[PDB]
Amino acid sequence: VNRLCRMRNDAKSDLDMWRSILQTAYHYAMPDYNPFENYGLAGFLTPGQQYNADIYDLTLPIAHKRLADKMLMNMVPQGQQWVKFTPGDEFGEPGTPLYQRALDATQRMTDHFFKIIDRSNFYLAVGESLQDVLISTGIIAINEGNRKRPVRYEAVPPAQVMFQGDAEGQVDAIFRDWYQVRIENIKSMWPKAEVAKLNKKPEDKVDIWECAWIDYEAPEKERYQYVVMTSSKDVLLEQSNSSWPWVVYRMRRLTGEIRGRGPSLSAYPTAATINQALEDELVAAAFQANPMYMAASDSAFNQQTFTPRPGSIVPVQMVQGEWPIKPFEQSGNIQFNALLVNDFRQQINELLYAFPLGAVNSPTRTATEAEIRYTENLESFSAMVPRLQNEFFIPVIQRTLWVINKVLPETFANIPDDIRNKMISVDGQILGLSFDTPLMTAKGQVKTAALLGFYQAAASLLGPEAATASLDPVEVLTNLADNQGIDVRNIKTREELEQLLQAAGQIAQQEAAQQGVII
Amino acid sequence: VNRLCRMRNDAKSDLDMWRSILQTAYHYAMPDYNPFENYGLAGFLTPGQQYNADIYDLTLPIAHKRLADKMLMNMVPQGQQWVKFTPGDEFGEPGTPLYQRALDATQRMTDHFFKIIDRSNFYLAVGESLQDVLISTGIIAINEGNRKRPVRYEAVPPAQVMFQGDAEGQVDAIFRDWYQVRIENIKSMWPKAEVAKLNKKPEDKVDIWECAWIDYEAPEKERYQYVVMTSSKDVLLEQSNSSWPWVVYRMRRLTGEIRGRGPSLSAYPTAATINQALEDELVAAAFQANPMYMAASDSAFNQQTFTPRPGSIVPVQMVQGEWPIKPFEQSGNIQFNALLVNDFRQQINELLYAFPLGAVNSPTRTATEAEIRYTENLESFSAMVPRLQNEFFIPVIQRTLWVINKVLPETFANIPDDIRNKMISVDGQILGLSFDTPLMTAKGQVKTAALLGFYQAAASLLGPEAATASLDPVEVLTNLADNQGIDVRNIKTREELEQLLQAAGQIAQQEAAQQGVII
Amino acid sequence: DELVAAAFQANPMYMAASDSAFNQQTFTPRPGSIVPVQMVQGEWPIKPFEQSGNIQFNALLV
């Protein structure tokens, strides 16, 4: 426990050193959803507070939101099967009869896995965490539920978590703060917590510390030490599991830091300059755009009897002493200010892969400078994204299967415990993963296209009935099905195909025998 | 009751903290439909008041209404089947004969479910709640009716409900205030209320509190406590069901707050500047656009005999004392004001996915510079919406089925109570859901396209009669029907298909035997 | 350099003998407003801050 507090205090000091830059970056990118506001209290103490009044320019907030939405649709397209379970290395080479039966089972698992995820709040939680990772770091908590909602997802605010990192930059200890949680609420989030020892009514509030760390001198099943306690060091729950609830995202990382640095953090100094420029324009327009006058005194005409009517004569003291009344002097270089603002806006847009051809008031471009500029923006965006698939979503899938095992133990029943742990931990031994996103097309269309290209050349030189004869039809059928990602149940097994092939051989032997030809 | 008053007073304090920003945000977005006006009473005290006289710029109100309308047609397109009931996990893997009979029943349930919804005020209530969620929070009440109108929907004004939140931001207590309800009205809304004990004539008005909260230490069927009482603490109804009437919507949420923050809330500071700029232009135009004159006195000409006809001579004292009569001096920079207004208008439009090509008098560009910008806005809109499907409408469907069971108990008759409750709760155990919206096309067309692509490759290498022979036709037919979302009754059952296939084999044997070939 | 220049070349600024040429605390920026201004102080009238430089030159090298 004393060691826990030393780790928590060290992780708390790191967060304090990040507060200044992260609060500023969030302010210019997501002013209304800034979790670092009010020194991390956000809306806990004073809800309904105004935050975005001094954000005059919305270029960065708009581009930041659209980039996060775009990443969500291209990485985990909702209503699509963007990941597949495949047989692991223990089942041998693909295409064998034994591998085919395992492939059928993993296709069933993939269908059931997505039915669970599609009815959860997975996409709501991922979308919020992606907006966090564009600035520094996203955190997703995956927790057990009940038979009605087996899996609960949540985007943990970055201002309420603290980290300890290992030498390689990976996270090996997480501390999450819960502010003023009711006692009755504690039992629902942590069913096995010991709340009786606190001796409090089921409406009192208490601060909760949810701690976890990697125990290096422990076996795999005890690797993650999990503790729930109060701010007065009253331990409510202690556990040791093979995983912890959280997954931590970084797009890019400066060495020696655990929290990342995303493109929206690179943009905020530019946003700060733009907002200052627009604020000056609003101040200037009040006395430069409006008709105003200079005189010795404002009594040059009577404001109360002033009559703004067509044809009206206004009594005016046209000269007062030495000075006549004149229009307020025009000053400044309005165009200069709205040349820097436009230039800096486009840098933000290019930095965040947004608005490939300017704003609405942009110069005209034909099908030449618009199609190319569109594909230039699209190609660069599609180059950044796919490398983040394994970092972001493989740990999420592994933790989801672990939760499903805990909440629905029947799903992994009648299985030896040794292979059950390997199966739940999707590592490629017994169960593997294969992502299918709009960026990484299929990897199997290439194999099929090469096979079709070979046949066209072969049939051009030797004709059909010779190119087809120089083929292993059972192997070709099985490989075409795997290349296309087809359901195994839709095609006959290898043994059925071999029996069919042998029968076709006898049919041709009898057919040829009736024409005097012996094969 | 003493605990109820503490909970309600806490929830009221949160609402009072939100009143200032929400009344301001509703003013610039929906000035005529602001529920926070007159300290929440709105039109209950004084109907027919003017609210929008000081809204000079309609950019935000137009974009706000169009976005809410656009979300309605893309999430729940009226006159279409935007959700389907499917068999739950208890029925096993899809495609089996037992699953196929459950699928026929759920398809019948879907048709009947939409007949009830299509004749109710569902779409009217959802459309109004979507306008509320674009600012902070939408609330929909789903109440029991009679056999003529089984389900009643209502968009609850956000200024008349109060919330208590759990530690994860979910609502776990709702308090709705009813202002000056007649006694005869109480019995129609809550049929089993004890109105007789009040000893009042059926025309007196009484304030009503409609309270509900989650009882954490209670079983599933008693989880939601529901109390109706008067403002003088006179309990009229007490219940404990498995659900409560309301569903609460948030698009985005700042941590620590229960009410959300939507894009229209992010836009109102910009709208405030635009409105202030336009008000100045209106003030300026009255004495800058109109022809006015400055002189020592308005007696420079006789206004009563002034004759404005062509060729007329007007007697004018062209000089009075030292000062001649001259046009009222022009001042200001009109173009400056109409450069900020247009710039801020487009930011509002981009923030709310409205008017990709700008206003009517826009700098028109070529076709491609317009088609690309149109697809930029459509793609960004189609990314935000789908993640809100489960948050908004799954609880609505579950509560609708609960009301249907209560009002029409014969619909779930001859069903064991254990499975009846699991069926009413559409949680994926016995009954699941599947959405079909213009944003998520089918998820089954991908499976069919892969199957068709595999067959084209197989028939290219091996020809027809060989690609077809290497198929499980019964499985193919059943999976094609499921992928297309087709009605099960339109196709023969698996046993009928297998009998047909067996007969087709016998036909082939006899026809081959007549040619001297034995299969 | 452009950012430094814009703060006093793009914004409307004025030169005078003293910043007491008008009262910043009671300055009223509304349409039709008359601002009391000491239009000449001693020998020097109040005038817009003098424009200088060649903005186009800088945004030709960049």
DSSP states of A316-366: ---EETTEE-EEPPP-S-HHHHHHHHHHHHHHHHHHTT--TT--TTPPP--
Report the SS3 class of residue B410: helix
Q: Which chains touch B (3 or more CB pairs under 8 A)?
A: A, C
Place of tokens 């232009």: B281
Q: Read off φ and ψ for residue A427, nearest 5 degrees.
A: -120, 0
d(CA B264, CA B134): 6
Residues 6+ apart with CB under 8 A from B519: A503, A507, B508, B509, B512, B513
CB contact under 8 Å between B261 and A32, yes or no, is yes
d(CA B171, CA B224): 12
> Which residue, among B311, B229, B333, has the nearest Cα to A334 in the 3D structure?
B333
Question: Across the interface, do B287 and A291 touch by the CB < 8 Å criterion?
Answer: yes
Beta strand pairing call for A171-182 and A205-214: antiparallel
Provide the 3-class DSSP secondary structure of residue A202: coil
Q: b/e string for B299-308 if b means 16 or more Cβ within 10 A? A: ebbeeeeeee
> How far apart are the C-alpha atoms of B2 and B10, rounded to whole Å?
13
Taking CB atoms and an 8 Å cut-off, how many pairs form between chains A and C?
95
Helix (H) or strand (E) run with residue B392 in it: helix B389-407
Q: Which helix (H) or strand (E) holds B15?
A: helix B2-29
Residue of C nearest to A288 (CA): C12
Q: Is the CB of residue B393 less than 8 Å from the CB of residue B401? A: no
Between CA A75 and CA A449 the distance in angstroms is: 25
Three-state SS string over B144-208 comes to ECCCCCCEEEEECCHHHEEEEECCCCCEEEEEEEEEEEEHHHHHHHCCCCCCHHHCCCCCCEEEE
Is residue A252 within 8 Å of A135, Cβ to Cβ? no
Chain A interface, best mutation among B252, B470, B518, by max A CB count within 10 A: B470
Smallest CA–CA distance from B376 into chain A, residue: A355
Max Cα distance, chain B (Å)? 131
Contacts of A501 (CB under 8 A, 6+ apart): A473, A474
Interchain proximity B332–C32, CB inside 8 Å: no
**In contact, B389 and B137? CB cutoff 8 Å:** no
What residue has token string 């996409």?
A123
> What residue spans of A365-444 are helical by DSSP H?
371-384, 389-407, 417-424
CA B398 from chain center: how many Å?
17
* Helices of type H across A235-319: 263-288
The C-side interface with B (CB below 8 A) comprises 30-32
The nearest CA of chain B is from the CA of C30 a distance in Å of: 7
Kindly give the residue spans of alpha helices, DSSP state H, lying in chain C.
2-9, 55-61
- Integer CA distances (angstroms), A210 to A4, A77, A149, A245, A345, in order: 11, 32, 22, 11, 42
**Residue B213, both tokens:** 């909260």
Extract the tokens encoding B271: 């709208």
Angle, alpha carbons B235-B241-B247 (nearest 5°): 95
Measure the CA–CA gap between B269 and A430, rounded to whole angstroms.
Answer: 56
Q: How far is B167 from chain C (nearest CA, A)?
A: 47
Contacts of C40 in chain A (CB under 8 A): 322-323
* Cα A130 versus chain centre, distance: 3
Of A32, A289, A367, the CB nearest to B266: A32
How big is chain B, counted in residues? 519
Cα B56 to Cα C2: distance, rounded to the nearest angstrom: 37
DSSP state of A203: T
> Residue type at B279?
E
Q: For A212-237, give one letter per residue: b (16+ CB within 10 A) or e.
A: bbbeeeeeeeebbbbbbbbeeeebbb
Beta-carbon count within 10 A of B260 CB: 23
Contact by Cβ (8 Å): A48, A55: no
SS3 A232: coil
Q: What separation, in Å, do the N-terminal and C-terminal C-alpha atoms of chain C show?
A: 12
* Secondary structure (3-state) at A514: coil
| CA dist., res. B165 & res. B11, Å (int) | 9
Residue A104 CB-half CA count within 13 A: 13
- CA A304, A306, A310: angle at the middle one, nearest 5? 155
State the resolution, in angstroms: 1.9
Going by C-alpha positions, the residue among B277, B340, B333, B280 that lies closest to residue A338 is: B340
SS3 A80: coil
Decide: helix, strand or coil at residue B141. strand
Angle CA(A160)–CA(A162)–CA(A163) in degrees, nearest 5? 150
Cα–Cα distance measured from residue B6 to residue B362, given in angstroms and rounded to the nearest whole number:
56
Question: Chain centroid to CA A368: how far?
Answer: 33
CB A102 within 8 A of CB A91: yes
Q: In angstroms, rounded to a whole number, what is the distance separating the alpha carbons of residues B245 and B175?
A: 12
| φ, ψ at B151 (rounded to 5°) | -125, 130
Amino acid identity of residue C40, one-letter, is V
Residues of B in contact with C30 (CB under 8 A): 280, 283
Identity (one letter) of the amino acid at A177? D
Give CA–CA dist B432/B417, Å, rounded.
Answer: 18
For residue A61, which of A37, A35, A31, A36 has the smallest C-alpha distance?
A31
Q: How far is residue A495's CA from residue A474's CA, in Å, rounded to a whole number?
A: 9
Cβ atoms within 10 Å, residue A45: 12
Taking an 8 Å cut-off on Cβ atoms, the answer to whether C12 and A273 are in contact is no
Dihedral-angle region of residue B180 (phi above 0 means left; psi in -120 to 50 means alpha; beta otherwise): left
Inter-chain Cβ pairs, chain A and chain B, closer than 8 A = 351
Rounded CA separation A183/A169 (Å) = 36
- Residue owning tokens 């503490």: B6
Task: Measure the CA–CA gap between B4 and B2, rounded to whole angstroms.
Answer: 5
Tokens standing for residue B465? 């009669």
Helix ranges (H only) for A119-182 are: 122-133
Residues of A contacting chain C (CB within 8 angstroms):
273, 277, 280, 284, 286-288, 290-298, 300-301, 303, 306, 322-323, 325-326, 328-334, 336-337, 339-340
Question: What are the phi and psi torsion angles at B217 (to 5°)?
Answer: -95, 50
Q: How far apart are CA A217 and CA A211, in angstroms?
A: 18
Q: Distance between CA atoms of B141 and B247, rounded to whole angstroms?
A: 7
Torsion over CA: A25, B349, B371, B338 (sign): negative
Interface test with B, best of A23, A62, A78 (most B CBs within 10 A): A78
Experimental method: cryo-EM
Residue pair A33/B252 in contact by the 8 Å Cβ criterion: yes
Q: Structure tokens of B45?
A: 């005290």
Q: How far apart are CA A267 and CA A352, in angstroms?
A: 9
Q: Which of B350, B369, B441 sits opposite A365 (nearest CB)?
A: B369
> CA A209 to CA A20: how far, in whole Å?
23
Which of A294, A325, A331 has the CB atom closest to C12's CB atom? A331
Which among A295, A333, A336 is the nearest to C34, CB-wise? A295
Decide: helix, strand or coil at residue A25. Answer: helix
Percent composition of chain C: helix, strand, coil (DSSP 3-state, to 5):
30, 20, 55
**Inter-residue long-range contacts of A84-87, CB under 8 Å, 24+ positions, other chains counted:** A84/A110, A84/A433, A84/A434, A84/A435, A84/A436, A84/A485, A85/A109, A85/A110, A85/A113, A85/A426, A85/A431, A85/A432, A85/A433, A86/A431, A86/A432, A86/A433, A86/A434, A87/A430, A87/A431, A87/A432
- Token pair belonging to A214: 């990697």
- Region of B413 (left: φ > 0; alpha: ψ -120 to 50; beta: rest) is beta
Distance CA A500, CA A441 (A): 34
| Closest CB from B288, B462, B472 relative to A468 | B462
Cβ atoms of A47 and B17 closer than 8 Å: yes
Residue A189 distance to chain B (closest CA, Å): 9
* Strands, sheet with B151-155, edge to edge from the N-terminal-most edge strand: B151-155, B138-144, B246-249
Taking alpha carbons only, the member of A454, A433, A322, A506 closest to residue A87 is A433
- DSSP notation for B103-140: HHHHHHHHHHHHHHHHTTTHHHHHHHHHHHHTTT-EEE
- Convert A59-77 to b/e letters by CB count within 10 Å (16 or more is b): bbbbbbbbbbbbbbbbbbb
CB A385 within 8 A of CB A75: yes
**Residue A327 CB coordination number (10 Å):** 13
Q: CB neighbours of A39 closer than 8 A, spacing ≥ 6? A: A19
φ and ψ of A7, to 5 deg: -65, -40
Type and span of the H or E element at A74? helix A59-75
Q: Which residues contact A256 (CB under 8 A, 6 or more apart)?
A: none
Q: Which two tokens stand for residue B290?
A: 């109109």
Closest CA to A58 of A373, A364, A352: A352
Q: How far, CA to CA in Å, does A217 sit from each of A6, A223, A224, A238, B41?
A: 19, 8, 11, 17, 65
Residue A2, helix vs strand vs coil: helix
DSSP-assigned letters across all residues of B30-77:
-GGG-TTTTTTTTTTTSTT----TT----HHHHHHHHHHHHHHHHHS-
The answer to whether residues A227 and A211 touch, using CB atoms and an 8 Å cutoff, is: yes
CA-to-CA dists, residue B500 to B325, B465, B496, B497, angstroms: 105, 18, 6, 5
Instruction: Quote the distance between the C-alpha of residue B152 and its chain's center.
Output: 17
Q: Give the residue from chain C lying closest to A331, CA to CA.
A: C12
| Amino acid at residue number A215 | D
Strands B326-327 vs A431-435: parallel, antiparallel or unpaired = unpaired
Question: Any bridge partners for residue B338, and if so which?
Answer: none
Alpha-carbon span A64 to A353, nearest angstrom = 9
CA geometry: angle B353, B354, B356, nearest 5 deg: 95
- Report whether B40 contacts B19 (CB < 8 A): yes
Contact present, B19 and B259 (Cβ < 8 Å): no
Chains that touch C (3 or more CB pairs under 8 A): A, B
Q: Can you tell me whether residue B364 is helix, strand or coil? A: coil
